[PDB]
Ligand binder design. Structure first.
Ligand SMILES: Cc1cn([C@H]2C[C@H](O)[C@@H](COP(=O)(O)OP(=O)(O)O[C@H]3O[C@H](C)[C@H](O)[C@H](NC=O)[C@H]3O)O2)c(=O)[nH]c1=O
Ligand SMILES: Cc1cn([C@H]2C[C@H](O)[C@@H](COP(=O)(O)OP(=O)(O)O[C@H]3O[C@H](C)[C@H](O)[C@H](NC=O)[C@H]3O)O2)c(=O)[nH]c1=O
Ligand SMILES: Nc1nc(=O)c2c([nH]1)NC[C@@H](CNc1ccc(C(=O)N[C@@H](CCC(=O)O)C(=O)O)cc1)N2C=O
Ligand SMILES: Nc1nc(=O)c2c([nH]1)NC[C@@H](CNc1ccc(C(=O)N[C@@H](CCC(=O)O)C(=O)O)cc1)N2C=O
Ligand SMILES: [Cl-]
Lengths: 274, 273
C-alpha cells in the first residue's frame, strides 16, 4: 500500500534536522509529508522553518484529515501544536519527542517550568502518543544538566540538540517497529498549562538567592520576553557562592546586585549594557 | 562559670521530651532555664506544654533578655517562635533543630511545603543559629521518606519523632563543644514564608493525579484545617497506579473519585462528620 510512509509534524530546528536526516538516510521526498504548525510562515529565522524546508525539497504539505486513514504511516510529532485523538488514526505508529525528563513537566513552557521549580537537570523523552498530554509510554530518555546560569533560551537550545540526537538514536527501531517502551509512573508526574505560567513574572524577593536567580533566568528568552526589574530588562543572571549579607538589592547603570534570605550574590545584567 | 548551663526555647513534644532527657541524663533543674513560645497555654493539649513541664519540675521560666549575658550558655531552639540576633548573646553556642532536609524548605509550614512541592522525602536538620532564617551551618541531618499517602499531620509527627532522636544523638557533643559543622550550599536552597501559603487551599484540577493528591494531602492536618472539596472536608487522600481515564471527578456520599491529566485514581475520603 500507500506511497506515504512518514509524516513529520511540528516546527523548528528539531523538525527540520530530523526531516533532513530521514530524507538523507531512509525515505525519498515522495514518501514523506509534513504538517507544519499553524504559525509557520515559511521563513528561516532564529529557528529553521519546516514549511520552508518542505517547499525547498519537494515534500507535500498536508492536513491531519489527509493522513488519518493512511495505513501504517509513522506519525512523528517534533514540537507539533495539535492534540491528536489516536482513534482517528488507522496507524498506531504515533510518536513524540517531549522536551522534559518525563514523567516530570508534562504540558507546556518546558524551558521555563523546570528552572522555575529549582531543577538541576532536565531531559528529552521519546514516547508513544496516547490521548493524554505527554502521557504515553516512554521509549528512550536522555537527561542532561541545567547549568546554574543557564537561561530558558539556553535550555531550549539544549532540548533542540539532545532531541535531534535522540531522534537519530531511535529512528531505525521505529522504522522497523522493534522498539521497546514502558508505562509512565504516577509518582513524580507533573504538568503545567499555559494558564499556570504568567509570562510577565513578578519576582518574589523574600526567597533564597537560588530561587530569586531561578525566577529571573526562567524568563530570559529574548525572542519572546525578558524579565523586568525596576523598569529595566534583564539579559543574564549569575549566581555565586559568595555571601554578601541577607536581602541585598542595589541598582546600578548596567546591573543589579541582589541576594535573598540566605545572602548569596546574584548579578542581574541589564540588556542596556554595551 | 554560671549556674545556668542551658536554655531550652520552644514548644511541643520535641521540646518537652528533649528537656526531660537533659533533666534525666545531664543537668539538674537549677542548671536549666526555659523560654516557652508566646502561645503556650500552660496546659497539655494535643501536644504537651513546655511551660507546664518546666513549672512542674522546678525550672525557671525566663526571657531572652535574661539570658543574653550568661557566659557560655547553650541556647537550644526546638520549635521556638522568635528570631534571635546573635550579637545580643555573649555565648556563640546557639543551636536549632529545623523540620526539613536543609538546604531545602527554610522558613515555615514545613509539613506542608515539601508535600506541595512534590517531594518523596524530607528530614530534620540540627544546625547552628545565625542571623538568617534556617541558614546556619549544618551539624547533623536525618532524612526520611514522605510515604505516598502521608498527610501534613503524618509528616509533622515524623518530624517530632526524628527531631527528638537527632537531639539525643548530638546533645553530648554540643554540651562538650566538640561537634563538627559545614556551611549550607547555595544550590537547592529554598524558603517559604507565611504569606507564600494560603491555608484555605483551592485545588487546581488541571494537574497530574500525583499533583492533585499532593495538593489535598499537604493541607490535611485536622488540628488546624482540612482541605474542602464542594463543601466537604477531606480527611485522607489515597493515590493508586490504576488508570481510570483522564480528568475524572465524581462525588459520592463518603468520598470523591478523582484523576488528573494523566488519569491515575485518587480516592479523597470525606471526614465522617
Ligand atoms: C510562546 C513562548 C515561549 N517561550 C519559551 C518557553 C518555551 O518552553 C519555549 C518554546 O515555546 P513553544 O515552542 O511555544 O513550546 P513549549 O515549550 O510551550 O512546548 C509546547 O508547545 C510546543 C509547540 C509543543 O506543542 C509541545 N508539545 C509537547 O511535547 C508543548 O510542550 O519558548 C517563552 O519564553 N515565552 C513565550 O511567550
Ligand atoms: C499554624 C498552622 C500550622 N499547620 C501545620 C503545618 C506546620 O508545618 C505544622 C506546625 O506548625 P507550626 O508549629 O506553626 O510550625 P512550622 O512548621 O510553621 O515551623 C515554623 O514555626 C515554628 C514555631 C518554628 O518557629 C520553626 N522554626 C524553624 O526551625 C518554623 O519553621 O502545622 C497547619 O496545617 N495550619 C496552621 O494554621
Ligand atoms: N494526544 C496527544 N498527546 C500528545 O502528547 C501530543 C499530541 N497529541 N499531539 C502533538 C503534541 C501536542 N502537544 C500539545 C500540548 C498541549 C497543548 C495545549 O493546547 N495545551 C493547553 C491545554 C489543553 C487542554 O487542557 O485541553 C494549554 O493551555 O496549555 C497542545 C498540544 N503531543 C505530543 O506528544
Ligand atoms: N536568627 C534566627 N535564625 C533562626 O534560624 C532561628 C531563630 N533565630 N530563632 C528560632 C527559630 C525561629 N524561626 C522562625 C522562623 C520564621 C519566623 C517568622 O516570623 N517568619 C515570617 C518572616 C519573618 C521575616 O521575613 O523576617 C513569616 O511570615 O514567615 C519566626 C521564627 N530559628 C531557628 O533556627
Ligand atoms: Cl553558622
Amino acid at each position: 500500500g500507500h506511497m506515504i510512509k512518514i509524516c513529520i509534524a511540528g516546527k523548528n530546528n528539531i523538525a527540520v534536522n530530523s526531516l533532513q536526516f530521514i530524507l538523507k538516510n531512509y525515505f525519498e521526498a515522495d514518501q514523506i509529508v509534513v504538517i507544519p504548525n499553524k504559525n509557520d510562515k515559511g521563513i528561516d529565522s532564529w529557528q529553521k522553518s519546516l514549511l520552508k524546508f518542505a517547499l525547498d525539497n519537494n515534500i507535500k504539505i498536508v492536513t491531519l484529515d489527509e493522513i488519518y486513514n493512511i495505513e501504517q504511516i509513522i506519525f512523528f510529532s517534533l514540537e507539533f501544536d495539535q492534540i491528536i485523538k489516536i482513534e482517528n488514526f488507522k496507524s498506531d505508529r504515533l510518536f513524540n519527542i517531549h522536551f522534559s525528563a518525563l514523567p516530570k513537566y508534562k504540558g507546556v513552557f518546558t524551558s521555563i517550568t523546570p528552572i522555575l521549580n529549582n531543577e538541576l537537570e532536565s531531559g528529552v523523552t521519546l514516547h508513544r502518543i496516547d490521548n493524554g498530554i505527554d502521557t504515553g509510554n516512554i521509549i528512550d530518555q536522555h537527561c542532561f544538566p541545567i547549568d546554574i546560569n543557564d537561561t530558558a533560551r539556553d535550555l531550549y537550545f539544549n532540548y533542540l540538540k539532545y532531541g535531534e540526537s535522540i531522534f537519530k538514536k531511535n529512528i531505525q527501531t521505529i522504522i522497523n517497529n522493534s522498539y521497546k517502551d514502558l508505562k509512565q509512573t504516577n509518582i513524580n508526574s507533573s504538568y503545567f498549562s499555559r494558564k499556570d505560567i504568567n509570562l510577565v513574572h513578578k519576582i518574589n524577593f523574600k526567597k533564597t538567592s537560588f530561587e530569586i536567580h531561578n525566577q529571573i533566568r526562567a524568563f530570559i528568552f529574548q525572542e519572546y520576553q525578558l524579565p523586568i526589574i525596576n523598569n529595566s530588562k534583564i539579559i543574564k543572571s549569575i549566581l555565586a557562592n559568595e555571601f554578601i549579607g541577607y536581602n541585598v538589592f542595589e541598582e546600578f547603570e548596567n546591573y543589579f546586585i541582589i541576594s535573598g534570605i540566605d545572602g548569596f550574590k546574584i548579578i542581574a545584567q541589564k540588556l542596556n549594557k554595551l
